[model samples]
Target chain A: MFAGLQDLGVANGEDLKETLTNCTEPLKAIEQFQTENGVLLPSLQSALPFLDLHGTPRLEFHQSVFDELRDKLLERVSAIASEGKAEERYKKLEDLLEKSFSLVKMPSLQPVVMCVMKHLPKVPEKKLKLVMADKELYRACAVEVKRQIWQDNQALFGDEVSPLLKQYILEKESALFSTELSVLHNFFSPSPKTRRQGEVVQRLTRMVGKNVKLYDMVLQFLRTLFLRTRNVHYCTLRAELLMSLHDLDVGEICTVDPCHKFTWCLDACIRERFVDSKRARELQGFLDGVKKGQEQVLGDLSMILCDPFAINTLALSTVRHLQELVGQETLPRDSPDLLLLLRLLALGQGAWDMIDSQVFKEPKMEVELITRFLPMLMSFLVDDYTFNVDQKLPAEEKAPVSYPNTLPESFTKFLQEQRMACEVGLYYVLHITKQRNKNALLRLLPGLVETFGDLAFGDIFLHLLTGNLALLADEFALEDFCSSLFDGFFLTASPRKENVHRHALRLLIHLHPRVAPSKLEALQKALEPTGQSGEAVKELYSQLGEKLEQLDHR
Target chain B: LVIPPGMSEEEEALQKKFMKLKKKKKALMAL
Candidate 1:
């Protein structure tokens, strides 16, 4: 009998009856057998029912007959409850439904919900408008349902929930914006009836912002959504949230504000000038808040001055925005932010030596600004007011001296390091600009001389000088810088002895125009008549000259 | 025991023998 009903699909009451009737007796017998042996049936008993074919010959049974009988009985009972028009039958049906509900596992409910959603008509105008008005609530509801489904049946739904929700949102978005959905719109749009919903969403979002897990998820979602839309509204919303991170008052721990503004400005410059008048005004307000908050949290002006993220963001924004103003031809040369930005860059570089590392090590188009602007930074060291107030002081209890400035030992050391970094930065700038801009190269030459002249050349400067000569072997001005570099070395060495003989020889070999008679004569004079010292010089000249020739050919 | 409609005579005999063998096997394993 069970075999006879094997092909029948369980779509209606009849098939269910056939299925139940075929299996009930064997199931009961298996239960009884287990009980008789004092062994309880496993929870998987539903999946492990015994067939009549497995029974003993003496106890042969028609399983289908038993199943058919049991199913017919259930069907009769159900029919009676349906047609009886009696309260007891209704009560019985309700009890049956409750039992059925308990038997339905949560994992199996996904297909049922999906089927229900598929059958649902495009939401009516009234409901569509409501969702539009309370978009956050709709989104929150979708998120909550997805989260619950993931918790229940992660194996089935884990990967698809986010994409599915996004799909549903897109499908319904146009309807949400339609005029018919205005009723829903009113709820979120400052109307009396649904104003509470709007408030609730705002409160909930803020609450979620405070929760680390939820906040990160929401932020990630918002970022993706904002990026996808690329609308000013979305950009502003994302910027606002990113800026709020600074309000945590963990200075440097949350250096994201300045970095975020830099990113936003760059994005606006590259894509849309979404940072228009109104947006700029709003950003100004936000920046003011950031400044006030940061000042209060950091307390020490020196730390703020030394913060690389802050300095870079300040530089990037000022330059980008200044470019914008210049491109529009509306802003004057003396724009306050531009001036303030320049001053800040100077101060930052001035303090860079004090710090252990550079803000930027890569040579880019900005190298010109870095090198050209460095002298302004060096000048700050000489300012009486700045020196008196900002300079590091010794432990003595005298009033901060202003005249005949005595540099603190640490300050002097920092100055040396800054001078070295500046030289390296300038060398790369000059090397690159030699090909691109002759005037800019000439303009930077004096600053280079001043820097190399003033600061004691360490290994870093020596390497920079030698490396640059190798880099720009063909450029005469580069050779000129090299010659000046060597001259500076000789000027600093006492008793007229070339203490840096190796560096001098390396520069000469690389800078020599060709293996002409003049060049050869100079080399011979430097290396010949082989004394112990002369032999060492000759060996150095031969090695360096061969390397330079190889570089020139390559 | 009375044989039910769905169970074949051959199947019923095999089941009886299999149950007896299983009981003996359990007893041996316990030892």
Candidate 2:
């Protein structure tokens, strides 16, 4: 496997890198190389290119090149005829890309896919098998690409979904799905600038909930495709679609276990910010069922209390529901239903922007439960409420004790890998405090400022304080907390990443009026270190001057 | 409703409004 490492994909990683020793597109090359060489190379495949007898590529198409053509197909398609006949010469190439992308073992199908798409305008009158074949090849490449991403992202849970995942990917003979996918490529296929995500939602009604396995694959595809794709309506539509199938698993074709159902629904709703009520209700129903089920046999809340991370699968979007359940009931106050609540908050804390205040709502609970866990909430906010112990129950009293600032090892690694640090902890802190106790949050803000620093956490905190200002400026206490943050991070930190620094400067400017002129000194001081000559900094400085003049007039 | 590159600010705003209206229609029809 090491011998053919280049053959597997390192070679396919880039056009020039194949000769340069180290591949720039390491991922694409590995995928292409993996497809040809099985087992250790596993499977990573990209565009089909002509290869040497030793199975090395002489020429290839970067996905970007195909992406370029695919993007222009909208205009190219305006010139297309419904009954155009495609040439016979392209026939062999069609089968080749078709097989290479989806079925063939070793050869790259990418160039063939690109070539056919390139000629989409002049495919002759009505004999265009290449057109359909090109469509198949493109969809095939996407599923395969998604497969590698799924594998790379979830090394532990790679499973039977490969066959079903490929099945779920749409292979359209007509141009509707083709056109939509083309115009949307910049948005999908892990592209940076995503557009028209609703098309995916529009397509969801057909196959969703029809088959359990396919549903999972489709959701995974949508998740990967729209992971970065955000439009408020499309997000709402996607959330509504998830709500429809969340119970996608009846005892139908094949029953998905309750846990997997919760995982899909929660990941979409929380991580994607596709907040919908039915989805929330579906999650609440399952969680409530767990509590009711456990109470029936164990005669206590063993499901959650015994296994604290049991609700780890739940997303932050569902935090309100979890709080509602524990809020309505009298949690032992001992388990700190805080355990499960913290775990649920841990995953999505950053991706919480799409959270619909209407859907997530407020916690609906009983006063006894609130009184019992009130100190625990305070401790959780202060650091971790280890206060007022029964002193009777052993220290082994709580199943597995963990705190707000510190998560268990597994959770810490997950947050770092996914959100880029204990961002989950800080993000969770911001959220619970924002919703429940805006005042107590200031107590936690000092730690958040120091921990996240200005670069990573500044934008969120700025926007958050901006959001809460009407209430915060309800006097100067929270206003001071906001000012302390400006000084702590943005005003104090170095401009290591130019792009991030620009964003921080703007955020400070946004909060300038609210922060009071005394604190604006931090903003001016921070600007001191940035170069006087650079274009961005100069423009930034000019903008600050203009804004300060405007602000002073107010 | 996907805004192409190099769109003018007014064009972009108009595009956004159009996209929102179309989306609202679709959502209402679904309801």
Candidate 3:
């Protein structure tokens, strides 16, 4: 303080005393020096103490000095470009400055990271729409920032520099990885895949092929994107990516993770979007490993039908493969296990859409699949163990219960289950009701009437057969239908038993409108003596009487 | 009463007496 007293230029000791008294704080004097000279002081540490200013002030005197000094340093770093042989000198100066800054702390050191992050591309619009305009400059800016950080951390320690700097560097690099990978992932999305897009996929493939280390990052994105994709009007773009993944490496897939779900994405991708052998083989192996057995193979095969896409090419191809498998007979066609899969494909697409497909067609995998099950189910439906009325079905040479094969009695407890399986097989084949099978039911109908003949009326099968005759009424509408259907099958099917009598009456009535009255005479005469049949017979007579009266009035 | 600055001394003395009387009446309200 005394050394600078002469510079105050006071007249004498009293004047010096007065000057000292007048200036309560040295900050004002320093502030005056700064304003008068218009020179920004370099650093807080240097200027404050040297000017004998108070070490600390209420105002942020330090931050201003710190920011000014930083500006000067950054400016000096930038000015290297204009200096002669600028690049060489700039590198040397950066190296020196980076070491100094890293080894020691500065007031604005943490704030510097905040400055870099504000320029980060927060929205996708900036990344995609605007980045093209300012890309080269922005990239250069990023490169410069990275170099600054790298050069600093090279001299800094784990704890020495900054958590903010560490955090910023990590996040910046993370953003870089995310952005670069995102560009690669969406490259093949737009149609007519640009050469640029192919280039990105090829580059990514090369990166993945070279470094299996990037597998985790490569996998998670594909799983997220590829799995949820549907409504694929069957494009070649997906087919192309599948080939790329397989062509990239398949052996490396199991090496990655034997049960890795990313492989399934590629698998389902190959199955749905497009088809080919190489990709299909890859899917086969991957799926075989994921699912346990052949039934599992058929299980997933059924589940793949759950596509809501209007036209699921993926769903169709599965049966194409399945049709071959069943034809070769490795996958059994008869077991209850495989029947579930067959029926799934039966009406899988509405109105038995798959029923008409090449897979569902003959050498009749679907047709034969249901046809083979048809008789067994016919046997199942009439199986003495399950059918309530089958107890009266005599086990005689002229037994009423008829089936393609004489299946041994099914267990009583499992009877409903067997019947359900039989019903599933029935509904599946309902569309393809082989005329021969209908002929068989017709064959059995009269046999049931002839054997237990009067007792068979209450039977559901009797009603079920009666229902079938209603469908056949169109065919039965032919001039000789009643004699042909009823005379052959139902003419003799009248029952003296109670509900069976009513059912027999109903059947006669069903055939009555379409039946020749002469053929119906035998059915009515046979069942009408029973109490329940009397009402049904009276109703039938009254219906005809009303129709006759109406015609007479006409 | 609209008296001018040029009032007679007798009139001034009467005005002074009137003011004293008004004040004495005002003070008599307690009585």
* Cα RMSD (angstroms) for every candidate in the order listed: 33.7, 24.2, 41.1
**Which tens-of-lDDT digit does each residue in A1-554 have in candidate 1?**
12212233212345445545758586775555444432134653443345323653322333445456556655655465457547665565444433332222233222332222222223234433343344352343333333333233333332333453354344333222222211122111232112213332333334333334444454355445434543212222233333344334333323533445443342333223122344445434433443533442111121233233333344344535433442332222224444444433444344423222333221122332322232222222123223333234344367654343232232233334453344333433333343433333333333343343343333223433344434444444443443334443423431222223544554556555543434444443543323434443467667665765565664
DockQ for each candidate? Answer: 0.00, 0.01, 0.00
Who wins the DockQ comparison?
Answer: 2
lDDT of each: 0.37, 0.39, 0.37
Ranking by TM-score: 2, 1, 3
Per-model clash counts, in order, read 19, 29, 4
Residues A247-302, model 2: lDDT tens digits: 34335422443344554555444434434556656655555565433333121121
Write out fnat for all predictions, comma-separated: 0.00, 0.00, 0.00
Regarding TM-score, does 2 or 3 come out ahead? 2
TM-score of each: 0.27, 0.35, 0.23
Give TM-score, chain B, model 3.
Answer: 0.71
Best by TM-score: 2
